[PDB]
Every structure is written in C-alpha cells, then in structure tokens.
Amino acid sequence: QLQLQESGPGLVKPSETLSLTCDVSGVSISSNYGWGWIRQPPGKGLDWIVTIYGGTGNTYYAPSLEGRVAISKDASKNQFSLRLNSVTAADTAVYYCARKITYSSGWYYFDYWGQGVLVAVSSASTKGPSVFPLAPGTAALGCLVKDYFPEPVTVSWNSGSLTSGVHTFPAVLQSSGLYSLSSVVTVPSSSLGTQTYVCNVNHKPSNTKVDKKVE
Amino acid sequence: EIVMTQSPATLSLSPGERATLSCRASQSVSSRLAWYQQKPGQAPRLLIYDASNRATGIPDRFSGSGSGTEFTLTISGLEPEDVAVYFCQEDHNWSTFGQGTKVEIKRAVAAPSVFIFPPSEDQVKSGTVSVVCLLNNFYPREASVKWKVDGVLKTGNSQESVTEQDSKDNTYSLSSTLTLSNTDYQSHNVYACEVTHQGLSSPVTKSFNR
C-alpha cells in the first residue's frame, strides 16, 4: 500500500501543453506529504520541477517562465498532476513523480519514486516498428526493431521465460528521424534447432504487438 | 537557485576498495542534503538523508558526511551490484539536484564474443538492408568496430549502441548496424566487421558472403 504510477502522452507537439498524472495508492493525497515532479533529459541528470504539499497546499517551483508550470492535487481521484504548456524541444525527458517525507531535521526528501514516463517533443508523427529476425560452442540470435517513433519499446524473448544472456541495446536515432532497436541473446551452439526463439516486441504508442520467431 | 556540483564525473574502482563521491553547494545548506542511487534503467532510491543518516534497507557500506557546503558519500568496499549514477540533493522546500556521478566497477579484462548477422530476406524486399555486428560481454568499455565491404573500409553509414554495465558480471555489449540499400548490398559479396579490444592480441573478423 504505497505506489506512484505516472500517466500521460508519450508524444506532444511543440508549443502545446503536456499533462501528466501521478496515480497514488496506499496513502491519501491530502496527508501532509510532498508530491513533486522531477524530469531527466536524455544523458543529463535529475532536474526538480515543482512540489506541492498535501495539507498545507503549498507549492514550490523551479525557475521557469511565468505560468508555464502548473501543479494540482485531486482528492477525489487521489492523484496529483502536472501541466507544462508552451513546450519546446528541450522538454523531452523522463518525468518522475515522487513522495516527500520529513525526517528529524523537519525538511523533506524524495523517499519513494515512481516508474517514470518519458515524453518526446517533436512535430514527427507516431510510426509503427518493423521486426526483422537476426540469425548468423556459443551462438547468437536477435531481432531488429526498425523505424519506429517514439520511444519506448519493450522486448522479451520467450514471453519472459528465458532471460540469461539477453541484451536489449539502447535505441539509436537514425538520420530519418526514426528509431532502430536490436535485442540479442547468446545461446549454446547445439540449440539452433532444438529450441525455438520468439522475441516479444510491443510498441504502445502504435499498438504493435508482434511475436517474431527466428529462423 | 543553489547550484549543486558533484565530483568526480566518473569513477572506476574494483570491489573491496572504497569510493569517495564529493558534493559542493553554492551557499551553506547545513545538513539538509540527501544522496540517491539510480541503477541503470531504474528509478532513484534514497540512500542518505540529513547528510549523515543511512535510510532504511540500505547496506552499511554506504555512508554520508559533511556540513555546510562540502559533503561526501562513501561506499566502503564496492560490490558488483553498485554500478549506478549517484545524485546529491539539496532541500529547503525548493529542491536542487546535482549533476550526478557515474560509478563503474572495474573488472578483469574480458574479450568480446563477436557475431555478425546477415540481413533477412524479408528486409531486402523493402530495399533497405542492415547488417548487425554484435559484441558480447567485454571489458573495458572502449572498443573499435570497423565495417568493411568486400575489403574496402566503409565509414559513414554505421551506428553503435553500447548497453549499460551489467550489475552482475560488470561487462558491456555493443551492437553496430551497417545500413545499405538493396542495389548497393546486392552489388558486393563479402561483408565483415573487425573489432579491436584490449583483451585481444590480434583483431578478429567475422564475415559472410552474398
């Protein structure tokens, strides 16, 4: 009974407003905890945006343009949301919601964090991926997830059953403005035929659920 | 604003010896500081609060110390699972995070397992062809990947992607993708990728014809 789940669109056009909601369970949004939003741009570190305190209703904002940032509690749905309008390309990041609790000093710290939702800011539209099999004492096998937008993509290899020797590589950004992904798995030599392999690649933004079987 | 800056940017130490992560603040902030750990691909976890207190469920090898503008996070005796980025954080009721510090646990030199993947026939139907070169479980991280098309070097049409350091064996894996067109791929025979690594006395080459 304590869980924070971020929710919101993974892609927002520029100059629009991104809205993200944090589902809180096991604890009331009205108890005097701190509810904050922290983002992480690709490659950079964490960056605090805003905090709102249940009970007091106090809000605290990091330096930004007047009225860009907005935060709001909701006791009926037991959630707190963030609104960031006039969004530019520098707003693509991974956004986390977290809880603040005091300690002996009387000041708050983010003790429990959320899974985090990543939002991209561009004029590019959503595109579904293509999946291509990758086959050549130890052997290798993989799937190529090509030409999709935006991130992320989930790859598992026999519906989660096989996991040792699996590597899903960080997605690359091509010249075309699309992403290309590869997920491999190291396999014993005498297994190319004895055991079948089916990469499970799903892309939520485009609703692409494909189980691709190799060789 | 209270700018929080961390040092060093990167670390590389073996298990057993301690790592000292530093943290400087603009103005004095008393002990109102926390330390967070962010394992690759995960959300941050609270390690220290009030500058010198270990949070619940944290191994005793993590320590916090410092007061005013200078603080220190100590990891007495690194473990393989300690690979992460560490964040210093100031809190009045405005919060300010540091820029982070990458901790890498240095490992025995391990040579990569090189694999090359020819394109699928379904892929040559589209007109764009990708050939993937795979490096598996190598250390150190720095590595060279050369793409050669029928002997000649092909530089300008490939992209690399290196995973995070594994939290078990502390190795890396690299994936290079060489992209060509249908008419360009079907106009040459042998395709190879040559890798150079510290764990290799000689560069190895994996290739295929057609």
Numbering used by the authors:
A (entry chain H): 1 to 35, 35A, 36 to 52, 52A, 53 to 82, 82A, 82B, 82C, ...
B (entry chain L): 1 to 210
Article passage:
In the present study, we isolated and compared four nAbs from three rhesus macaques that were immunized with a group M consensus envelope called CON-S. Although, the macaques were immunized with different CON-S envelope vaccine regimens, the CON-S nAbs had immunogenetic commonalities, and were able to exchange immunoglobulin chains with each other and still maintain envelope reactivity. To investigate whether the antibody sequence similarity between DH840.1, and DH846.1 translated to similar variable fragment (Fv) conformation, we determined the crystal structures of unliganded DH840.1 and DH846.1 antigen binding fragments (Fabs) at resolutions of 2.7 Å and 2.8 Å, respectively. Overall, all four antibodies bound to Env gp120 where C3, V3, and fifth variable (V5) regions converged.
Antibody DH842 was recovered from M172 PBMC, and DH845.1 and DH846.1 were isolated from 80–12 PBMC. Despite being isolated from different macaques vaccinated with different regimens, DH840 and DH846 antibody lineages were both inferred to derive from IGHV4-n and IGKV3-d heavy chain and light chain variable gene segments, respectively. Superposition of the Fv region of DH840.1 and DH846.1 Fabs showed a high degree of structural overlap, despite the 71.5% heavy chain and 83% light chain sequence identity. The DH846.1 VH differed from DH840.1 at position 99CDR3 where the inferred germline amino acid serine was encoded. Although the heavy chain CDR3s of DH840.1 and DH846.1 had low sequence identity, W100b was present in both antibodies. In agreement with the immunogenetic and Fab structure similarities, exchanging heavy chains or light chains between DH840.1 and DH846.1 resulted in chimeric antibodies that still bound to CON-S envelope—albeit weaker than the wildtype antibodies. Both of the two most potent neutralizing antibodies, DH845.1 and DH846.1, had no unoccupied trimers and exhibited 3 Fab to 1 Env trimer binding stoichiometries.
